[PDB]
Amino acid sequence: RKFFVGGNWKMNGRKQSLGELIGTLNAAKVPADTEVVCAPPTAYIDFARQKLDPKIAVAAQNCYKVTNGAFTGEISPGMIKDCGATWVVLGHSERRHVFGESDELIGQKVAHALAEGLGVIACIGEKKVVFEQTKVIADNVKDWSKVVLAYEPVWATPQQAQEVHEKLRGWLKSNVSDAVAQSTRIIYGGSVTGATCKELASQPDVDGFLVGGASLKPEFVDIINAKQ
Amino acid sequence: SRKFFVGGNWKMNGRKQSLGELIGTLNAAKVPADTEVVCAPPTAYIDFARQKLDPKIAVAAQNCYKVTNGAFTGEISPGMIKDCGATWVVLGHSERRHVFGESDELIGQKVAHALAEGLGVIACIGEKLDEREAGITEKVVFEQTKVIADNVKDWSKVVLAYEPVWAIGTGKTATPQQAQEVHEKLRGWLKSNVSDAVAQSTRIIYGGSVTGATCKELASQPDVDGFLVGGASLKPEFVDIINAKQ
């Protein structure tokens, strides 16, 4: 499984600060065996893709479930792809908990994004429920090649992460297939810093990170190099 | 002496190619000096549209959140909107209220933050079919306007948009007389609850169905100060609507 590091900038930054962030990432050497993705605020998807070296992919932080329509304030996978981004983050804990996005809605978003040719970082996390969330996503995924699962212990150790990730992979094994369980990256979306990433990355069922606040920082480069 | 205001809400439509062409047509268009024109692109294209649009046309975001930065994956702030060169944000749109369940409380908080951050706000209100049919038009639009007003300290950068949600795909249609009726009552609310000056100076734009064929009569109504145009804003007839006061 190829190591996967996503940086979720959340609702942070402006062109100046984000430009410097991107310049730092452009100046770094990412290991060829690491897949790196940055998720800027929606207003800056286009900006980020223009400034970021192509070695780094760009993700939207959310999308809606039809290609065009009367949904003021939303964007579609087609627009995301049109801006040069190749991923979308769906079901992030903040969309589920602050904005009340249901599992059904997230499932529909997953199916539409995949149909439109985007990769999906599909997020699950608790407050049984994690398995319910994963089932809804799985019911809307026919090809797992372009999906990555991100586990969010929104409630918040490497041992704790490894424990859940192993259960998640076991769910995929019993409910999808051995092949899907073996090949699907399951990345950790809990607290990750430059100082903690190495021991988390060493867990055999932890395949990378969906990094929060540290993704805004220089130490994101260290998280990228966590297997190095 | 209220300046005629025409906003074009592109909603979730368009790609760089089709929007670039739309923008080309607008840049080339004949527009009168007495009309303030604003375009609201999908959030992914705010930057794109501001770069391509002639500066005489302003850009609006279609939504924003209520703090300047934070842990709100998928949202943008007024600071980012300004940072992309946009000068307006549309808030409380019927779609946000009804499809995405945005509360009056949340919408008021957003209005207050956007204005503080230096943005103009196109604040939308309007009653649904069941509310209209129940005979509760006044009650609904006055409550929504009150929440907005309680969060506005300087009205100079606010425009109110009335959406007859009761007339969207419901079969039902609003006459210019019915539009004027609501606008007049909304202006009366401003006069009774804020001040004579605010009621006199605040643009109240019509956000129901407007076409090139319908815009002139709607614009002639004394309390209709312009439009927030939906679908037509993606078409060449938007130029005719810009010229409705003509």
UniProtKB/Swiss-Prot annotation, chain B:
Catalytic activity of the protein: D-glyceraldehyde 3-phosphate = dihydroxyacetone phosphate; dihydroxyacetone phosphate = methylglyoxal + phosphate
Disease / disorder: Triosephosphate isomerase deficiency: An autosomal recessive multisystem disorder characterized by congenital hemolytic anemia, progressive neuromuscular dysfunction, susceptibility to bacterial infection, and cardiomyopathy.
Cellular component, GO, one term: nucleus
Biological process per Gene Ontology, one example term: glycerol catabolic process
Pathway(s) served: Carbohydrate degradation; glycolysis; D-glyceraldehyde 3-phosphate from glycerone phosphate: step 1/1; Carbohydrate biosynthesis; gluconeogenesis
Catalytic residue positions: H93, E163
Modified residues (N6-succinyllysine): K146, K153, K191
Modified residue annotations for N6-methyllysine: K191
Protein name: Triosephosphate isomerase
Keywords annotated in UniProt: Acetylation, Cytoplasm, Disease variant, Gluconeogenesis, Glycolysis, Hereditary hemolytic anemia, Isomerase, Isopeptide bond, Lyase, Methylation, Nitration, Phosphoprotein, Ubl conjugation
Record-linked NCBIfam families: tim
Phosphothreonine sites (modified residues): T170, T211
Family label: Belongs to the triosephosphate isomerase family.
List of residues that carry 3'-nitrotyrosine: Y65, Y206
CDD domains referenced in this protein's UniProt entry, alphabetically: TIM
PROSITE patterns: TIM_1 (PS00171), TIM_2 (PS51440)
